[PDB]
Amino acid sequence: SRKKNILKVIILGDSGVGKTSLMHRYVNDKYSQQYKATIGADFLTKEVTVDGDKVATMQVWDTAGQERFQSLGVAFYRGADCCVLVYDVTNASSFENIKSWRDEFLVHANVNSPETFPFVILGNKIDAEESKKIVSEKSAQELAKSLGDIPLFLTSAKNAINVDTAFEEIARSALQQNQA
Numbered sequence: 001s002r003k004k005n006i007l008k009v010i011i012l013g014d015s016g017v018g019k020t021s022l023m024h025r026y027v028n029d030k031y032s033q034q035y036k037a038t039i040g041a042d043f044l045t046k047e048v049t050v051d052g053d054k055v056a057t058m059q060v061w062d063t064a065g066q067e068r069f070q071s072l073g074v075a076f077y078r079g080a081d082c083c084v085l086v087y088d089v090t091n092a093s094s095f096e097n098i099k100s101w102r103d104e105f106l107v108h109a110n111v112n113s114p115e116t117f118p119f120v121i122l123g124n125k126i127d128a129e130e131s132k133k134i135v136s137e138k139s140a141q142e143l144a145k146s147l148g149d150i151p152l153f154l155t156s157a158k159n160a161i162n163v164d165t166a167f168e169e170i171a172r173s174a175l176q177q178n179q180a
């Protein structure tokens with residue numbers, strides 16, 4: 001009935017990049033222009049089908065990007081099946097911080113094979129005006145390759161662009177990690 005081997009997904013990234021917006025666009029297909037800043041760590045669940053015939057339940061964990069609001073530490077990272085690294089295409093420092101988030105996860109999630117553990121990078125706010133978008137796709141692809149050929153998706157939680165495609169890959173990678 002209730003107890004399931006869920007697929008545990010952690011979403012990480014700087015404050016302001018749109019992690020909460022992405023979680024709500026994925027799980028509830030809704031977008032609110034103004035969410036409160038996230039404090040601690042909470043999750044939502046979504047039942048999904050992976051690649052046509054596998055049913056699973058995703059547990060998507062949303063986290064606090066601001067250090068003053070990280071009041072739960074990082075122990076909840078353990079047991080994760082996939083880690084999502086979000087940057088804002090309009091914010092260079094959020095992009096520059098992607099590897100430190102990857103590495104923070106790796107130190108504390110106690111995964112057994114860091115080299116094969118699935119990461120997915122999301123460059124969010126691709127709907128922004130072109131003049132505001134300062135992180136290039138080319139630059140993002142270079143980083144994703146350098147971190148181990150991790151998948152990169154450009155998204156908009158606001159306009160519902162590519163969040164479904166991205167989480168299709170998050171779900172398939174999570175399931176593969178969960179079952180291997």
Ligand SMILES: Nc1nc2c(ncn2[C@@H]2O[C@H](COP(=O)(O)OP(=O)(O)NP(=O)(O)O)[C@@H](O)[C@H]2O)c(=O)[nH]1
Nearest residue numbers: 015016017018019020021037038065125156157158
């Ligand atoms: N243009 C645009 N703005 C977005 C998009 N997604 C989120 N935003 C804005 O980015 C801002 C931060 O969004 P939010 O989801 O709360 O970010 P967060 O990463 O959860 N912040 P925190 O880490 O503090 O909880 C808000 O102003 C939000 O409206 C998007 O796809 N496009």
Ligand SMILES: [Mg+2]
Nearest residue numbers: 019020037038
């Ligand atoms: Mg948030």
